[PDB]
Design a protein around this nucleic acid. Structure first.
Ligand SMILES: [Zn+2]
Lengths: 104, 49, 11, 50
RNA sequence: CGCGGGGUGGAGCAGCCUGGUAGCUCGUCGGGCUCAUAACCCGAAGGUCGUCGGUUCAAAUCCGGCCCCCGCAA
RNA sequence: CACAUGUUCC
RNA sequence: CGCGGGGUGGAGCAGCCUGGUAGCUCGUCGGGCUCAUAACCCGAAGGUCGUCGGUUCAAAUCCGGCCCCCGCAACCA
RNA sequence: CUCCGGGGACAGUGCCAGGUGGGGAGUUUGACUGGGGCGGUACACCUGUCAAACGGUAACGCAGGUGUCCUAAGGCGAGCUCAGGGAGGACAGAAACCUCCCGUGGAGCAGAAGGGCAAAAGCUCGCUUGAUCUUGAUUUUCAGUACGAAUACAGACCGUGAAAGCGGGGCCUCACGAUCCUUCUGACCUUUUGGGUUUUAAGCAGGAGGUGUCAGAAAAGUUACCACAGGGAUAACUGGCUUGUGGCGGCCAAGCGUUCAUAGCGACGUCGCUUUUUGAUCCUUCGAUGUCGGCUCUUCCUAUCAUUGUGAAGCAGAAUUCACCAAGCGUUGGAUUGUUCACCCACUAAUAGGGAACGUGAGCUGGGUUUAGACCGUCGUGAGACAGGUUAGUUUUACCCUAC
RNA sequence: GCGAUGUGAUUUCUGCCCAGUGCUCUGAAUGUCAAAGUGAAGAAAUUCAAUGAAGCGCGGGUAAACGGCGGGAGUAACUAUGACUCUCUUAAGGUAGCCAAAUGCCUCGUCAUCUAAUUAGUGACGCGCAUGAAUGGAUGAACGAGAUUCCCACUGUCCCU
RNA sequence: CGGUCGUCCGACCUGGGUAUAGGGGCGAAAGACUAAUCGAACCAUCUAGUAGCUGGUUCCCUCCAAAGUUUCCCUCAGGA
């Protein structure tokens, strides 16, 4: 799908529609000192081999695309997540199409 | 080792008298496996020097 | 395979 | 799971050398003042099969 | 009768999935070189893509029913 | 660096 | 998933670096040479330098975002 | 002043870290299945049918589609009517473009199918992001539990239109995911421990990273050296049902048969029989009914090979066919192959077809299938596999009852 | 000499292939890397950056290492086969030998012999499903309580008891 | 056990002593032998190991009285 880099939508902190800068959400780095990671590392330490299951049966080939909103107001700077139905194609503000021109 | 049984030799077993694996073996191999041509730099009929 | 026959034994 | 023939030769008690009728250890003469500076004369008594 | 696969200048080939331009080896034909053949040089043609239908802006390209051949299922 | 070969009669 | 390094004339690589420079080989065509296919020399065409944004008097070059490829190292929904 | 020499701050040892590591250890090798395996997903959805006019309703039933795609193919507003056909006009023809008429949809709506739609839900423009945030209730599968999808609402902030209104995605029926863990976002929020500050970490709420075996284990094979609990719920054999297949027999008669359809044949259809063939099913048997042949022996059937009694030929004699009664009596010796089957030699009156748990292993044999040892060919990295060949491979018991 | 292998006397040979999986060799030219140590930011935990061995990635050797070693067509003057030629492909496309074999489905392959009659045996033919060279090929004097075919003699195996 | 068989001067047979002990030994190699037990010996213990799988489950009378159907589960001989 194609989505624009700007979108005027509702803001949680402001309480009304304001324009928002639009980009895709990315998974951050896993913290080494998280509670489950510290629990996993202490459990994985010592003998016994792999203690927790490892997922291998990868079935689906797509992801739910998430937009990372951005309040353009200089004093708001509110961020929130927005979900869109799954699609293999994704791009930001590209090739706004016409309606029936001469293609080649 | 081919005529031997597979429990007592790594070359034994099978319906035909064959090795089934490369006879040349590294010398990093452990005991009970380092069997055959140990660390062969050149394995074949020697021609010349 | 269906079998061999029987070398029974003491039992 | 069975221990191969090559591994069984290290424990001995079967594959040890048969040294019952062997005449002894074939060594050279031990070093002393004679070897280091001069020489010593030795006689060949007999020649035997090992 | 079933599944996987191919058919294309005369013999073999590429080019399709990502359609916008059909190329090449041998071969046929004409001329030159030779007294003549061969070899070599110059020039030109030959490809409805197996059939039907749909699609896309257009079908060799994507899809479905059907003919032949290679070996397979029983 | 290639120049292979063209049935018999006088 | 991370690191490293690469995307360039019709094809390949150079130039990137210490920013002003887009060159060479094969290939297309033309001319000269050969008995001629070849060989040899010159000239003409042949690049948004993978894409976008920012920096700079000046980047294909410096940085970030996106696509693809190779190597290695990984893997608790 | 080191016993002599030779090495020497290097071997080597202890502890960590990385590589390698079926040598060794543990474990796994999904489910449905007209046995199992193989092939497929009927394992998660949706459309028409099955489906017997509420609804629901099965099979590895039939025809199909799906794990998407869309910054618009979403939301309003405005303006038009499509497919097709006819008639005309230089290029222009069957169609390139213009004009007129008919045109209930025969077009199109993102797609397979169904429903629905004409001043629109279709085509073209204008503006926008209701594809935004937050409580609840209900429907759909349902246990009336979830997830997903949807339906009416409520509070905001909006878009659009002059406005009534419509919109919180796609005209509807489908396109998706629990716990735990991780990541992001939201707060003048809570704890971080005896108190205070700041990192950090743990909390609340809302999204995402997936389990397709789709209410969600982390998972390769072989055993012919195999083992256990079981299963006739489930296969190989006999017996049962069926006769698709095989074999056998009638009707019609178009014709062959020199002239003649039925002396003898006989196309196209059509009606039947059989369990001496193979298929189909799993009803009986897996706390065992000894799984092929050959030898020997008893009896039975006729769909009659020979012999007997008879009829008809396109039967001069002779010979040979066809038809009826007819199972009384006979149906051989051998080469090859384990063979069933099959072919050949010879004789004969003829050398017909079969059943009795595909008669018959406490009657015989062990040649072959079908253990464990081996050889060869193909396949597999491998252990090993082969309705692929070759070789050697323990055939137990009556003295019980019945029958003779 | 010891240890680990493969084949299996004598004679005659031991064809080609390192593309794959193994084995082995070179390397600061280095693409990667853990611990430890070094430097920097931070109040510190912590984070970042360079360095960082072996092993791979790269480049050679090895098949008496595991193993493997093609297909589609036309072509001499009767026709056929067809030396020969064209062409696609891989690392090589099976060379010397051998064969219906313990290896061949078709198959009880075809020919000759053995028989009155042979799916048996022997000798040849090779388009060989799927033969083939130390995963050894061919050969086979002597020998084998190894597996088959035929002949003389011999006999109750049998006629037929 | 009988007849018939292979070998019988050397890789021959055999007594006693001794050494190798179980995931071990040993094997001219058959998954063979290891005290009638070998594809992992025997004894004791964990152990009364587990079994969705077979078998069995003990006196009388009276009253009431079924289901093999929905959904889910690596669920199909079983459970909720
Ligand atoms: Zn805001």
């Amino acid at each position: 799908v194609n989505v624009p880099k700007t979108r005027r939508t509702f803001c949680k902190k402001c309480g009304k529609h304001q324009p928002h800068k639009v980009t895709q959400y990315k998974k951050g780095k896993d913290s080494l000192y998280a509670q489950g990671k510290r629990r996993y590392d202490r459990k994985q330490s010592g003998y016994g081999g792999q203690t927790k299951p490892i997922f291998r049966k990868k079935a689906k080939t797509t992801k739910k695309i998430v937009l990372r909103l951005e309040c353009v107001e200089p004093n708001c700077r509110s961020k929130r997540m927005l979900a869109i139905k799954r699609c293999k194609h994704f791009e930001l503000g590209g090739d706004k199409k016409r309606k029936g021109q001469v293609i080649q | 080792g081919v005529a031997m049984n597979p429990v007592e030799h790594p070359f034994g077993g099978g319906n035909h008298q064959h090795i089934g694996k490369p006879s040349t073996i590294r010398r990093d191999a452990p005991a009970g496996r380092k069997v055959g041509l140990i660390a062969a730099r050149r394995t074949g009929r020697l021609r010349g020097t | 395979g269906r079998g061999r026959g029987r070398g029974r034994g003491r039992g | 799971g069975r221990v191969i023939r090559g591994q069984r030769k290290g424990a001995g008690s079967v594959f040890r050398a048969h040294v019952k009728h062997r005449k002894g250890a074939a060594r050279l003469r031990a070093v002393d003042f004679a070897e280091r500076h001069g020489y010593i004369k030795g006689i060949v008594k007999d020649i035997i099969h090992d």
